[PDB]
Structure 1
Amino acid sequence: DELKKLAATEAAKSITTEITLGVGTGSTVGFLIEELVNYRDKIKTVVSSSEDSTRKLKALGFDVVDLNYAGEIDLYIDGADECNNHKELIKGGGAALTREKICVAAAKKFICIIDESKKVNTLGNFPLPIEVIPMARSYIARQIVKLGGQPVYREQTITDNGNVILDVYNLKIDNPLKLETELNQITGVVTNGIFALKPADTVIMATKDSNIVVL
């Protein structure tokens, strides 16, 4: 908590000029959003990847704009579910996989905040989310099995764009770039949760000893 405020404060320090800021989703991002009151004069435009964050930003007086109206994001700040030694991530375990990935895609710089528990040497212990067109769900699950993954439909979840989620277990993702590409080619896959083709630019990590290391 004090740790979260510290990691979020570190991230906020990257806001040094007038920018279009993009904001992610999750619990450490919550602390970032509170800290943004100290950078209001530099936050020209805010884009959000999730309803929760948007509610929180609006409560502090920030106007949140649609990405199509904002144009390019200068700086996107978000958490992750897993991070490896090359700033490649698994994200999407919560809400908003597709919105988060679009925001990262449109961002000049992506800062990812994590704690050390999420740091791994190989991605895959945390299940990989994949957003899929509903009509293709079973077809895609079958192709995922051929890759060695165990797909599990995420019950009672419909995404912002009317799709469903398969959470994929049992993968040892030693080549995130190649698996991300492969999953992209499966017909009916909208988005997958590997962020490797466009990895984080900076990772701020809160350590077991409650200090901050910037990678």
Structure 2
Amino acid sequence: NNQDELKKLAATEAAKSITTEITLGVGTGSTVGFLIEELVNYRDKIKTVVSSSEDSTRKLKALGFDVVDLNYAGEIDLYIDGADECNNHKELIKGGGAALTREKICVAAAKKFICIIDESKKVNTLGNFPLPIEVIPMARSYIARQIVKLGGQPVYREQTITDNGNVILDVYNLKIDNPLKLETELNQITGVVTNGIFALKPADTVIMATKDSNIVVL
């Protein structure tokens, strides 16, 4: 297997979109890890870095990058991040491992979002990967009940805490054939901070490393 080589390929290809002086936004996760290492070749163009997690921030600072709060940066020119799932319309499930809320905020504040994935993330319909939802701890049980009513199977990630001080519910069993509609419905549930459907603002570009080490750009 060469999943790491595919991740590195997609990350290396994406970094080439850094062609001018920008405020760069950086995702979280294993694929982004390869992207972060590649950024040492673009120091002349990276004016400002905004980070979606403390894990990414730690890695970026170790490489000599000046990571600033989004409030100080204003807007991101280019945000680069991975995904758990990507469908045929560049709509994503994100937030599996960490950073759901700040990743979604970074995407919102970014003029361009490039998603980097290996082929295993590519699906026709979202939902096989469980949907992460970050929730206010006090509302966890109420929200789980409302998700049951929506047809999902909610599970509490017991003892997990986000860097926003919140908890996570994973939703299993969902066939998400209408991402726009379900992302909207979940946003309406009191106590939901963020849900992991990235559809209302999808990826602008998807760089996919294929099983044969080719690059396909959606």
TM-score scaled to structure 1, two decimals? 0.98
2:153 corresponds to: 150
Deviates more, 1:76-85 or 1:25-34: 25-34
In the TM superposition, what is the alpha-carbon distance from 1:190 to its structure 2 partner?
0.5
Show CA shifts across 1:94-137 (max 9, x none). Answer: 11100111000100000001111111100000000001111111
1:162 corresponds to: 165
Alignment partners' CA distance in 1, 2:132 and 2:65: 30
Alignment partners' CA distance in 1, 2:121 and 2:14: 17
**Secondary structure at the residue paired with 2:42?**
helix
Alignment partners' CA distance in 1, 2:7 and 2:84: 15
Alignment partners' CA distance in 2, 1:214 and 1:78: 15
For residue 38 of structure 2, the aligned residue among 35, 40, 48 is 35
In the TM superposition, what is the alpha-carbon distance from 1:59 to its structure 2 partner?
1.0
Alignment of 1:49-198 (within 5 A): 49-198=52-201
Contact 2:8 2:31 in 1 (8 A): yes
Show CA shifts across 1:140-188 (max 9, x none). Answer: 1111001100000011111112111100000000000000000000011
**Secondary structure at the residue paired with 2:25?**
strand
In the TM superposition, what is the alpha-carbon distance from 1:5 to its structure 2 partner?
2.3
Q: Gapped runs of 5+ residues in structure 2?
A: none
Aligned CA RMSD, in angstroms, stands at 0.8
Contact 2:31 2:116 in 1 (8 A): yes
Alignment partners' CA distance in 2, 1:155 and 1:139: 16
**Secondary structure at the residue paired with 1:108?**
strand
Alignment partners' CA distance in 1, 2:7 and 2:178: 30
**Secondary structure at the residue paired with 1:167?**
strand
* Paired-residue identity, %: 100
Alignment partners' CA distance in 2, 1:187 and 1:31: 37
In the TM superposition, what is the alpha-carbon distance from 1:4 to its structure 2 partner?
2.4
Show CA shifts across 1:66-105 (max 9, x none). Answer: 1111110000000000000000000000111001110001
Q: Gapped runs of 5+ residues in structure 1?
A: none
Alignment partners' CA distance in 2, 1:60 and 1:122: 38
Q: How many residues align?
A: 215
TM-score scaled to structure 2, two decimals? 0.97
Contact 2:7 2:117 in 1 (8 A): no
In the TM superposition, what is the alpha-carbon distance from 1:3 to its structure 2 partner?
2.5
Alignment partners' CA distance in 2, 1:94 and 1:3: 19
Alignment partners' CA distance in 2, 1:73 and 1:65: 11
Alignment partners' CA distance in 1, 2:57 and 2:139: 31
